């Protein structure tokens, strides 16, 4: 029984910022989702495929695990057919999303007394995102008539902004580590079973 490596997917020391969410493939292993479901240490565990209890009996051919860190307020945005700054500029799920989402508070880890400076989110983008889209280029944003010409200025903005993760902030403004599992079935022998 060669178990799938959810360990370093959920227990990693560092997660990437939301605008460059990690995408780690899971395949050719047996996954024991029960310990995840029975962990009872997850603030949010919302499933949009099959019910969490049953999926341990359901087998797939690929499990993408996309990890990042967000604010508590935006947690709701990670759901199929949702709208908002995170769900159009940074990361949004397709409506027919076949998988589900784990998230837990991590203020003890990912916030600084002076405010954290590492985690960044894409404030502006000239268009919405395709499903499961990952854009990291950071050309200056032209919010006005003039072309910014590659330099900031009046109504020119750097398209990334830094969350001020401070430990004493409210629950709405606390850092939450988020994992998203997409279970897809392609025309290939299923390898990720119970």
């Amino acid at each position, epitope marked *: 029984t060669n178990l799938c490596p959810f360990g370093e997917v959920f227990n*990693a*020391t*560092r*997660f*990437a*910022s939301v*605008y*460059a*969410w*990690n995408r780690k493939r899971i395949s050719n292993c047996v996954a024991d989702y029960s310990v995840l479901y029975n962990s009872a240490s997850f603030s949010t565990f919302k499933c949009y495929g099959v019910s969490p209890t049953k999926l341990n009996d359901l087998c797939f051919t690929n499990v993408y695990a996309d990890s990042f*860190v967000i604010r508590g307020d935006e947690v709701r945005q990670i759901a199929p057919g949702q709208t908002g700054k995170i769900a159009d500029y940074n990361y949004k799920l397709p409506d027919d999303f076949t998988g589900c989402v784990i998230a837990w508070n*991590s203020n003890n*880890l*990912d*916030s*600084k*007394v*002076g405010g*954290n*400076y*590492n*985690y*960044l989110y894409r404030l502006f983008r000239k268009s919405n995102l395709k499903p499961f889209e*990952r854009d*990291i280029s*950071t050309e*200056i944003y032209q919010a006005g008539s003039t072309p910014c010409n*590659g*330099v*900031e200025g009046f109504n020119c903005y*750097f398209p990334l902004q830094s969350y001020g*993760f401070q430990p004493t902030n409210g629950v709405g403004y606390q*850092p939450y580590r988020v994992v998203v599992l997409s279970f897809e079935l392609l025309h290939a022998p299923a390898t990720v079973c119970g």
Partner: antibody
Amino acid sequence: QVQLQESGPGLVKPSETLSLTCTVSGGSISSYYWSWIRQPPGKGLEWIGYIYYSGSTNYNPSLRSRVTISVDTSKNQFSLKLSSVTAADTAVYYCARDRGYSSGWTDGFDIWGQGTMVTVSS
Amino acid sequence: DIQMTQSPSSLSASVGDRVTITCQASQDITNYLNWYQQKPGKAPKLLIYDASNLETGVPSRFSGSGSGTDFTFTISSLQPEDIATYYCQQYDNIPFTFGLGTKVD
């Protein structure tokens, strides 16, 4: 033991872009924050930016406009493309590394590796 | 940004001496300061991290202390090989700031 060795062009022309490349051997880009710093001749060290392996970057606000840091895990290397080069960038550049232990924020640089020279003039 | 200031712009002494370098901040930096040394023609090393810990592989003749907005890095016993330019640096806020250097002869 992380053998770190820079490799970039030793001379560029004004107003074009320069592109250094950092190679790491015996090193696991897989979890450390990697950063570039520069030293003008006879001045202090200037930090430029640091890059995670996924693509999560962060740049110095003064130089935020014209830098571009890329990471290539498969060939385990770094690209630093600095555009709009001026005479003020005549300096050596270093390819540092976080020390490790942290949660959500880098630490002091640890593994500088020998810095290469970059001359920008005509 | 943040302003580092090293009190000794330059310094000299003889072998086996105790020397002190003072790094003062423009605002509160709890312990997020590290001490590097640089011999000429070489990439800087790391000597002290988090303002108090000596990094593995470094001879124990160095030490560090401080908090708030002031810290000190001290060589208890100077050596002929300790000829170098020393830099304090913070990592508490962007951008990271390096002290303008202290030459030690």
